[PDB]
Design an enzyme around this catalytic site. Sequence first.
Site, short mmCIF file in Angstrom:
data_model
loop_
_atom_site.label_atom_id
_atom_site.label_comp_id
_atom_site.label_asym_id
_atom_site.label_seq_id
_atom_site.Cartn_x
_atom_site.Cartn_y
_atom_site.Cartn_z
N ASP A 33 -28.24 92.84 -100.37
CA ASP A 33 -27.75 94.21 -100.34
C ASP A 33 -28.65 95.16 -99.57
OD1 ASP A 33 -26.78 96.70 -101.05
OD2 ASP A 33 -27.46 96.60 -103.16
N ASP A 213 -24.44 99.23 -95.30
CA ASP A 213 -24.63 98.74 -96.66
C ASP A 213 -23.81 97.47 -96.97
OD1 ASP A 213 -24.87 98.52 -99.40
OD2 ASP A 213 -23.89 100.42 -99.85
C1 LIG Z 1 -28.66 102.20 -106.17
O1 LIG Z 1 -27.87 102.51 -104.94
C2 LIG Z 1 -26.73 101.83 -104.81
O2 LIG Z 1 -25.97 101.70 -105.72
C3 LIG Z 1 -26.46 101.67 -103.32
C4 LIG Z 1 -26.27 103.06 -102.65
C5 LIG Z 1 -25.57 104.08 -103.55
C6 LIG Z 1 -26.24 104.74 -104.58
C7 LIG Z 1 -25.58 105.63 -105.41
C8 LIG Z 1 -24.26 105.95 -105.16
C9 LIG Z 1 -23.59 105.34 -104.13
C10 LIG Z 1 -24.24 104.41 -103.32
O3 LIG Z 1 -25.30 100.91 -103.38
P1 LIG Z 1 -25.18 99.34 -103.32
O4 LIG Z 1 -26.56 98.92 -103.57
O5 LIG Z 1 -24.61 98.86 -102.06
C11 LIG Z 1 -24.15 98.82 -104.70
C12 LIG Z 1 -24.24 97.30 -104.87
C13 LIG Z 1 -23.38 96.89 -106.03
C14 LIG Z 1 -23.95 96.69 -107.31
C15 LIG Z 1 -23.16 96.36 -108.37
C16 LIG Z 1 -21.77 96.15 -108.24
C17 LIG Z 1 -20.93 95.83 -109.37
C18 LIG Z 1 -19.57 95.77 -109.18
C19 LIG Z 1 -19.00 95.92 -107.89
C20 LIG Z 1 -19.75 96.25 -106.79
C21 LIG Z 1 -21.19 96.34 -106.95
C22 LIG Z 1 -22.02 96.73 -105.87
C23 LIG Z 1 -19.04 96.52 -105.46
C24 LIG Z 1 -19.33 97.88 -104.85
O6 LIG Z 1 -18.94 98.01 -103.65
N1 LIG Z 1 -19.97 98.87 -105.48
C25 LIG Z 1 -20.44 100.14 -104.93
C26 LIG Z 1 -19.89 101.45 -105.55
C27 LIG Z 1 -20.50 102.29 -104.43
C28 LIG Z 1 -18.46 101.19 -105.06
C29 LIG Z 1 -21.91 99.83 -105.26
O7 LIG Z 1 -22.39 100.15 -106.36
N2 LIG Z 1 -22.78 99.25 -104.43
#
Ligand SMILES: COC(=O)[C@H](Cc1ccccc1)OP(=O)([O-])[C@@H]1Cc2ccc3cccc(c3c2)CC(=O)N[C@@H](C(C)C)C(=O)N1
Lengths: 323, 323
Positions: A33, A213
Amino acid sequence: AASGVATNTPTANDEEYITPVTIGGTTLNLNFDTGSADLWVFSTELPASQQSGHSVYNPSATGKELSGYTWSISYGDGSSASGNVFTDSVTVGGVTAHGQAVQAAQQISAQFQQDTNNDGLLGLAFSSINTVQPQSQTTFFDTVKSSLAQPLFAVALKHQQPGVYDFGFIDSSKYTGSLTYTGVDNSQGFWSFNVDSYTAGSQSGDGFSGIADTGTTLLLLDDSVVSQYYSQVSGAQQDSNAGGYVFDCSTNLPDFSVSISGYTATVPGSLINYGPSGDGSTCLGGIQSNSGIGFSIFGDIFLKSQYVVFDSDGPQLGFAPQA
Amino acid sequence: AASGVATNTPTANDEEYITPVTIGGTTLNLNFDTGSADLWVFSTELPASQQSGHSVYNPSATGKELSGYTWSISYGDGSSASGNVFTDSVTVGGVTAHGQAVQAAQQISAQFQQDTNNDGLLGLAFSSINTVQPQSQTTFFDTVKSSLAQPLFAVALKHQQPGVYDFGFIDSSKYTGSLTYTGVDNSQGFWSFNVDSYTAGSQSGDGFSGIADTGTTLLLLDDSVVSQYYSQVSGAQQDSNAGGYVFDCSTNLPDFSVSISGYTATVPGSLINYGPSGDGSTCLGGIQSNSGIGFSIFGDIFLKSQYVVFDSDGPQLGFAPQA
Ligand SMILES: COC(=O)[C@H](Cc1ccccc1)OP(=O)([O-])[C@@H]1Cc2ccc3cccc(c3c2)CC(=O)N[C@@H](C(C)C)C(=O)N1
Ligand SMILES: COC(=O)[C@H](Cc1ccccc1)OP(=O)([O-])[C@@H]1Cc2ccc3cccc(c3c2)CC(=O)N[C@@H](C(C)C)C(=O)N1
Ligand SMILES: *[C@H]1O[C@H](CO)[C@@H](O)[C@H](O)[C@@H]1O
Ligand SMILES: *[C@H]1O[C@H](CO)[C@@H](O)[C@H](O)[C@@H]1O
Ligand SMILES: *[C@H]1O[C@H](CO)[C@@H](O)[C@H](O)[C@@H]1O
Ligand SMILES: *[C@H]1O[C@H](CO)[C@@H](O)[C@H](O)[C@@H]1O
C-alpha cells in the site's frame, strides 16, 4: 547492487492485490500500500479464532522485541489494527531487509477479521507517517533503498492478471514510449502530485492534487467531477447497497484523463466498469466520491492503466501507458 | 503582538496539571502535554454515561466539521482515544486561535472514563506527530506562534501550588539567575535534548538523551540509573501494587542532577518523594523505570525544579532553577 521483482495478483474484481513476503522464514500474503507506512501482519498474539484462514507471524521464533514500543493505525474506511513491534528479516522479491520493524497485530477490527485474502499490509508511503511509538520506524523500502541499484520502485497492476512491483530498477518492456515525470509533495507523507486539468468524457475541468495509492481500490474524486462523469452515463444512479453509482453492465463508459506535466494519462472507459455491483444485476463504477476530503485518491482503477515509477530522488513520480 | 499567561493547577499528589481552555465559548479543564501533538476533548459524541462529571464540547453549536477526517491516539500507558475533527475558536490565557483543529472524542479507553480531573489534553509537542488523518493539523502553539511576540512558551510547574504557562514571553521573576539553552532534536516530534552526565546521590554516570514532557508525572530513566539511585535509599523495594520503588516516607532521599550544556539542573531529594504509595504507609519514588525504550522522560518530577523555555527558534530549550 540489489534489485528484485515481486509478483502481485488481484483478488476477485481486482478488489486488492496481494504479494508474498517472507518474514523470519514464514511467507505471508500482504497487500502492498503506497498510501500508508506501516508493515503489519496477523500474528500469534491474536486470539486463535482470528488466526484461522491466515498465515501468521510468530514473533517468538525469530523476532527481537522492541520493549515499550507499540503501533496503532486507522484507515480511510474506518478499519483499524494495533499491536507491538519486533525486528526481523523481511524478504520481498529476493530483496532482504535485515532488522526491518515488523508490527505484530494484537487487535484488528471487523473488516480485517473478515478478509481472508491477506495476512496484513506492507506500507510504501513515506516513513514520516509510520505509526510506531515512541519513535517511528522505516518502511521496507526506506530500509533497503540505499542498497538498491536505484532508490525507486515501480508498479504495474493489471486487470485479472498477475502484475509486478519492480524494486531498484525500471523494466522498460512494461510500458509504451518514454516515462514522463512530475514532482512529488511528500509533506503529508504521501506520494502526492498535481494534475493541470482533466477530461471526463465530453467535459473538461481545472486541475487538483491527488495521491498515487495502490491500497485504495477505486478512483476517488471530488463530488463535482463525479457528477460530471455520471451525468454522461445513461441510467447511472446511486445505490447505497452497492456503495455508489451503478449502471447497466452493458453501458458504454466514457474515458477519463488527467494532464500531468504535459502527459495525458488516460483511463479507458472499460476499466472504469469495476464489475458486478452485487445488488441486482448492475455494475459498480470505478469512479466514486472522495467524501469531501479536498484531494483525489488515484487508486487501483487508475493504476491499471499506467506503469508508475516511485522515485525517492526528488522525490518524483514517472508515468507511461502500460504495454 | 500577543502574549498571555495561563494558570495551571496540580491535582492530588501533583499527578497531573490542569489549565482552563475555552473552546467555542465553553471552558474545559485540559492537561497540557509537551509529549504529544493532539488537542482532543470530551464531547457530546460520547455516550451520555461517559460525559458525566465533565465539561464537554458540543461541536454542533460552533464548530466547522472537516468531512472525512478522523484521529486516533495511543499513549505510553496504553490508554487511547479517537474521534472526528472540527475547527473552532480556542482561547488559552487570553490568546485566541481562530480555526484551530479540535479533536472531538467518539471513543475513550477506561483510563479516561475514570479520570474526572480533566476534559481532554492539549498537545504541545511538534505538529509533525499530530494524528489527524488524512492530513495532520497544527497544535495550538503552532497555530498562534506567528502572532506571539516571541515564538515560544515557558512553564513553571509547582508542588501543590498554582503554576503558569507563559505564551509568547519569558517572565524573569520565575527563575534565579540567567537561562541556559541547549539544542533540540525534533526529528521524532518531541522536545528532545542531550545531557552530558548525571549524578544520582553519590554516583555519577555518562550522558543520554531525553524529552521534556509535562504530560508524564514521573522522571523515567534507564533501569541501570534507577538501580543506582535506589541502592542508596535505605529500605527501598519494588512494590507492583504501588507501581515501582517505594520506601519509608521519612527517608532522606539523595538529590538527582544532570548536566546540560554546562548547566547543572538539580532535582532536590524532597521533590523525589512523590507521595503516599497508596499501599500500606510507604511513599512512591519520583524516579522509576522507562521500560527500556532507550531515552529518558523528563516528567513533572523534574520540571517542578526548573523554569523551562520551549523556543521554536532553533529549536532550543532554556533552563534555570525556579525562584
Ligand atoms: C491511513 O491512511 C489511509 O487510510 C490511506 C490514505 C487515507 C487516509 C485517510 C482517509 C483517506 C485516505 O489509505 P489506504 O492506506 O490506501 C487504505 C488501505 C485500506 C485499508 C483497509 C481496507 C479495508 C477494507 C477495504 C479497503 C481497505 C483499504 C479498500 C479501500 O479502498 N479503502 C480505502 C477507503 C479510502 C475507501 C482505504 O482505506 N485505503
Ligand atoms: C503518544 O506519546 C505519548 O504517550 C508521550 C510520549 C511517549 C510515547 C510512547 C511511549 C512513552 C512515551 O507521552 P505523554 O504524551 O506525555 C503521556 C500523557 C498521558 C496520557 C494518558 C495518561 C493516562 C493515565 C496516566 C498518565 C497519562 C499520561 C500519566 C503518565 O505519566 N503516563 C505516561 C506513561 C509514559 C507513564 C504517559 O502516557 N504520558
Ligand atoms: C535487478 O538489478 C540488479 C542490479 O543491476 C541485478 O543484479 C538483478 O539481477 C536485477 O536485474
Ligand atoms: C513473479 O512471478 C511472475 C510469474 O508468476 C514473474 O513474471 C515475475 O517476474 C515474478 O517472478
Ligand atoms: C505579553 O506580551 C505582550 C506583548 O508585549 C503584551 O501585550 C501582553 O500584555 C503581555 O505582557
Ligand atoms: C492564572 O491565575 C493566577 C492566579 O490564580 C495568576 O497568577 C496568573 O497570572 C494567571 O492569571
